[PDB]
Design a protein around this ligand. Structure first.
Ligand code: ATP
Ligand code: ATP
Ligand code: ATP
Ligand code: ATP
Lengths: 544, 544
């Protein structure tokens, strides 16, 4: 096969891939670079990534990069052969490296040499562990030998291998970026046939990933397979005549971009349970009213990250974040995404149901992992929704998960975040009081920004922005409903415009421009979720 | 390699290193010192330290210290070789020592000979255990043989090895001191090239560690590696032309001190979860008002530790400590650090969220470990913040962690501390009543010092101290806001001066001197967190 694993295969790993390649090649082409400054390159390296992220693929490309002799050793077969000859085999590879040195010691998907740090007492497991530690020991500075590895679990590997002088440098490659997803799906398109250069399809492939925040590379490379198999069904019967494929019609059946759109289903993506990063596309234009908060909230979040220097000339402490509180449906979930979306900085999404929900929850650490993933990805703004559920007051809930896993965990995490650090915490919840008052302590959350319900005058703006996609009638006027009622939120009016469609649809089977009457009947169909009684609740709850 | 492991490599271990060296060398150069007085030096010794603290390194230096024949035996490879030949190998080393005696029996990172005290029943594990106990047994008084070892877990080693006559003396080296951190980072600078003697950089290196309380030595030695790798990236492309390094530009690329500042990130320090020691730099000048409390609190803490003798001439019992209670934001967290910071005595920091939070919390022992780390490090003052969370009243919380791990544990710990002992307990919490009244029993906490909210007259001082770093306007006067409102704490005014910057920034894009109006608009932006209603709460809560 003239075509072999090369860089162009990998995609979206450019920063990580670049660093790994640089370490190997700079050390590999010649030691003189590291030989002169700093220690020789660390022999062992661990590539920690979610499964099916391409780690296995990375090593081959690395091997082709400097031309060093390729070797690949796998945990599944490391101990494959019968016990007592396993150890001999492990030693043999190390012996093998010097002959072709400079060479690359290559093994992947290794849970076998270190099945568990302290849990497994098996001798076959133990013997290999020992030899490995020693081979690491048997490795010498002169040798152009590089050791590599990947694993599903970061800490699943032995802790001891962690001390430096063995596995000193580790780089973990995560899910590919939205633009990175294209590279993966783009390359496989080469074999994939579309009939034309189809830069639009390329642009189509661009959006193909955008249909979801992202997935694992492996599954993505499998997604393209779905289209082939699936799309092949339509043209498959015509060939049932005989076994040999007719040359009359040969490769004139091409997978249509719609095939993928039909292929995305049934492929059961989202095999990754790891913390994810997502950037929403919402824009302030989608935000009606609230000119004051947006203008101030923006300068609050944007200033520290975008203009840190000008913020230091004053000297006041930078903000660790702020919390949002108001009537349900004021758009908290929508606002945060806006500021986060507007800012280039990476975004992170946290859900109160999901935090208990996302993992076993036996350990609420996921949250402690959030900042770690957030800190590394900084500058970024972390978002926590329904922080109350996540951090209910301590007395109310008799559970380990509520207090032990998170509320206690939460105070510690906030201190860790730093102003220089590009991390920022934006909370939103229905009832501020429900959450532990401990979070309102000075320095944990600087200010509490209340979101007032949409004003009738603001209603005039809130309505157009949402119905812009909706076809409207020439006679129907939006401001009418605004002047009618002062009690409706944005969330209720959300469904309000929603129900209007049903009303307009109910009269006429085929869709037509909505009518003012279509709002009135629906206007009384859903009453305001916010009365003058609750407004006082927050007005008083604004102090605590 | 002419350069080999020597004392100068180690740093910050001077007391511990000195003691170990003395034990080996005094015994090693000649027995006559110990031979005449006291028993011969204990053959076995265990060096207990957090991982990556340099323990491994210590043995080599010790070996070079008296010139005794070096031998190093490691747990990873102790049992490395196939079972049934492992035991023979262990015996062989002991046999080996006499030939070159005086010699040093040297093995490190040993969990293998004693994988677990009672948990592991493996024969290979057991056989070695037995031989080890016996070799300890086979060791004889005449022999100039010294046995050493390190482990992550102190009690992880077998309990039996603990009885004297085997492993009698143990010294554990912890995290290096702030000044000690310099030694580590300083020595590696030798290979590290800066272009000049750069005593400033040395002073720069001085502060390099001060950016954080501290870390593990190993990681620190790795930190310098980050700069090399990271800093090498800027000058790395220019060499892409060919593999051989051009002699035209040779070592004219030097790591800049800013590189480290850029290197500190991404290095994921703080791999140590052990109890830590930190000394804050706060000074009373940073403390506005409260002339009475500081003057009295100082004489309360300082007197016993600094002037114990003059305190004994009276004869009254010394103080085990005292508790602080007052409105949130009165500066409790700030005051304690001040007195602790002012005093040379080492400081310890305890957080209520963190204590549940810091470890699994299944065992609240960490706290019992606190004093142990505190007692050994005395004279020092232990600090517990939000003692309520840590020690809520027993009836309110239905949890094992709250009562079993700590409140019950707490009473026992206090008795252990002694007046001669330089340990002192300074508590602070929002609500004294919330904590178990059991802590107010006589002798546990002598007095309860209430911190009154900042007085308007004191406000005049509180404001300047905080804004000293802030550029101010010639017309703007500080006392104005003081005479306006009697209800603001220090913590709220904290943000108050904070929000002022935003106000001043909001008008003018580039930062300029603040204006009186900038305070007024913000003055009403945040109302006092303490009204005349809460003051009565503490006024009455002052009795219990
Ligand atoms: N960024 C990427 N670039 C190219 N291929 C990728 C990428 N990520 C995943 N893959 C795909 O993964 C498949 C090979 O298996 P994979 O890469 O999953 O092994 P690995 O990720 O190294 O180890 P594991 O399979 O255990 O995760 C290839 O078909 C390859 O196209
Ligand atoms: N300023 C606004 N501009 C446009 N739409 C808004 C605005 N505020 C709220 N909405 C509407 O509210 C709907 C959902 O908001 P949501 O209820 O998620 O906010 P929230 O109630 O603060 O968050 P949560 O529901 O998680 O408590 C959106 O569909 C949006 O149309
Ligand atoms: N105080 C110190 N002085 C000099 N080097 C140190 C110190 N603390 C840690 N190190 C570094 O540790 C590295 C060697 O490994 P290390 O010292 O961590 O082994 P160990 O601490 O004896 O055992 P473990 O690695 O299991 O903790 C060396 O690069 C050394 O510079
Ligand atoms: N005497 C003082 N001088 C200067 N600043 C003070 C003083 N008292 C309080 N402060 C201000 O209070 C802020 C934080 O104090 P903090 O709220 O931590 O004290 P506390 O409320 O007693 O402790 P905790 O918040 O843990 O209950 C500091 O930034 C400081 O500026």
């Amino acid at each position: 096969e003239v075509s072999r694993i090369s860089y162009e295969d990998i995609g979206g790993l450019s920063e990580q891939l670049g660093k790994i390649r640089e370490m190997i090649e700079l050390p590999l082409k010649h030691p003189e670079l590291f030989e002169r400054l700093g220690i020789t390159p660390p022999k062992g390296v661990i590539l920690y990534g979610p499964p099916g992220t391409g780690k296995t693929l990375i090593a081959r490309a690395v091997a082709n990069e400097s031309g060093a002799n390729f070797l690949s050793i796998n945990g599944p077969e490391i101990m494959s052969k019968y016990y007592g000859q396993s150890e001999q085999k492990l030693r043999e590879i190390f012996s093998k490296a010097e002959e072709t040195a400079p060479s690359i010691i290559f093994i992947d998907e290794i849970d076998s040499i270190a099945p568990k740090r302290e849990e497994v007492q098996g001798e076959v497991e133990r013997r290999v562990v020992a030899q490995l530690l020693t081979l690491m020991d048997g490795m010498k500075e002169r040798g152009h030998v590089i050791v590599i590895g990947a694993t599903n679990r970061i800490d699943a590997i032995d802790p001891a291998l962690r001390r430096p002088g063995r596995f000193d440098r580790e780089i973990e490659i995560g899910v590919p970026d939205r633009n990175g997803r294209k590279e993966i799906l783009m390359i496989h398109t080469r074999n994939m046939p579309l009939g034309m250069s189809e830069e639009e399809k390329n642009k189509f492939l661009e959006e193909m990933a955008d249909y979801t925040y992202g997935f694992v590379g492996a599954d993505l490379a499998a997604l393209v397979r779905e289209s082939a198999m699936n799309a092949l069904r339509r043209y498959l019967p015509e060939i049932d005549l005989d076994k040999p494929i007719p040359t009359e019609i040969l490769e004139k059946m091409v997978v249509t971009e719609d095939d993928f759109k039909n292929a995305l289903k049934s492929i059961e993506p989202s095999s990754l349970r790891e913390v994810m990063v997502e950037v929403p596309n919402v824009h302030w234009d989608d935000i009606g009213g609230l000119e004051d908060v947006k203008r101030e909230i923006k300068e609050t979040v944007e200033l520290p990250l975008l203009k840190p220097d000008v913020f230091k000339r004053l000297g006041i402490r930078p903000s660790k974040g702020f919390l949002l509180y108001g009537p349900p449906g004021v758009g908290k979930t929508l606002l945060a995404k806006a500021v986060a979306t507007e800012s280039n900085a990476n975004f992170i999404s946290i859900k109160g149901p999901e935090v208990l929900s996302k993992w076993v929850g036996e350990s609420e650490k996921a949250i402690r992992e959030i900042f770690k993933k957030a800190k590394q990805v900084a500058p970024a703004i972390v978002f926590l929704d329904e922080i109350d559920s996540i951090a209910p007051r301590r007395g109310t809930t008799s559970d380990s998960g509520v207090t032990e896993r998170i509320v206690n965990q939460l105070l510690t995490s906030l201190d860790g975040i730093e102003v220089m650090n590009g991390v920022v915490v934006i909370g939103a919840t229905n009832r501020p009081d429900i959450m532990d008052p401990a979070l309102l302590r000075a320095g944990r959350f600087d200010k509490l920004i209340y979101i007032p319900p949409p004003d009738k005058e603001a209603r005039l703006s809130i309505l157009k922005v949402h119905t812009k996609n909706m076809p409207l009638a020439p006679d129907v006027d939006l401001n009418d409903i605004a002047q009618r009622t002062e009690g409706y939120v944005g969330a209720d009016l959300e469904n309000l415009c929603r129900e209007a469609g049903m009303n307009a649809y109910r009269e006429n089977p085929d869709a037509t421009s909505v009518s003012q009457k279509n709002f009135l009947d629906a206007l009384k169909t859903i009453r305001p979720s916010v009365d003058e009684e609750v407004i006082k609740f927050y007005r008083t709850l604004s102090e605590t």
